[PDB]
Write a structure and sequence with these properties.
Elements lengths: L3 E8 L2 E10 L5 H12 L11 E5 L3 E4 L32 E4 L11 E4 L12 E7 L1 H9 L11 E8 L2
Length: about 160
C-alpha cells in the first residue's frame, strides 16, 4: 500500500487540525519516499516545526522550506536536489500534492497543495499525492494567504509523521 502521512497545522499558535496525504509511491516512489521520510524526520531533519511560507488564495498553499523558511531553502533525503521522477499524475483539481521547484530537476523539500485545478503546471511539477482528509484545514490555510503569497497568520507544521 501507499503511505499515508499527516501534517498538524497551527495558525498563530492555535490548532487548525490535520491534513492527511496519500503519497503515490506506486507511481513516484522516489518522490513519495522523500516526502515520507521528511514527515517522520527519521534522517535527522524534516518538516516538523516549519511553515507554510507562501499561500495564494484560489491557487495553492506552499511549504517545505525547513532550512530558510522563505522559499530559498530546503533539501531532499538524497542530497540538495533530485530529478523530476515523471509527470504521470496531473494537477487535476483541489487537494493535489505536488513538488515546488526552481526549474527542471531541482526538487528539494518544497511542496504545495492545490486549491484549484492547476493544469498549467502539468509537465513542470511532479505530482506525488493528494489530500485524503483535511481539505477544511487546507481552506483555512488558504484563507490566510494573499495575492502576493504573504501569509496574514503564522502557519506552522507543529507535528507530522506517518500514519501507515
Amino acid at each position: 500500500g501507499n503511505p499515508l502521512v499527516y501534517l498538524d497545522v497551527d495558525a498563530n499558535g492555535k490548532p487548525l487540525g490535520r491534513v492527511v496525504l496519500e503519497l503515490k509511491a506506486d507511481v513516484v516512489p522516489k518522490t513519495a519516499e522523500n516526502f515520507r521520510a521528511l514527515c517522520t524526520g527519521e534522517k535527522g531533519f524534516g518538516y516538523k516545526g516549519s511553515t507554510f511560507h507562501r499561500v495564494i488564495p484560489s491557487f495553492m498553499c506552499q511549504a517545505g522550506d525547513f532550512t530558510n523558511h522563505n522559499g530559498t531553502g530546503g533539501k531532499s533525503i538524497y542530497g540538495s536536489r533530485f530529478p523530476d521522477e515523471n509527470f504521470t499524475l496531473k494537477h487535476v483539481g483541489p487537494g493535489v500534492l505536488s513538488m515546488a521547484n526552481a526549474g527542471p530537476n531541482t526538487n528539494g523539500s518544497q511542496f504545495f497543495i492545490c486549491t484549484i485545478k492547476t493544469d498549467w503546471l502539468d509537465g513542470k511539477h511532479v505530482v506525488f499525492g493528494h489530500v485524503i482528509e483535511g481539505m477544511d484545514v487546507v481552506k483555512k490555510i488558504e484563507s490566510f494567504g494573499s495575492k502576493s503569497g504573504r501569509t496574514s497568520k503564522k502557519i506552522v507544521i507543529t507535528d507530522c509523521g506517518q500514519l501507515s
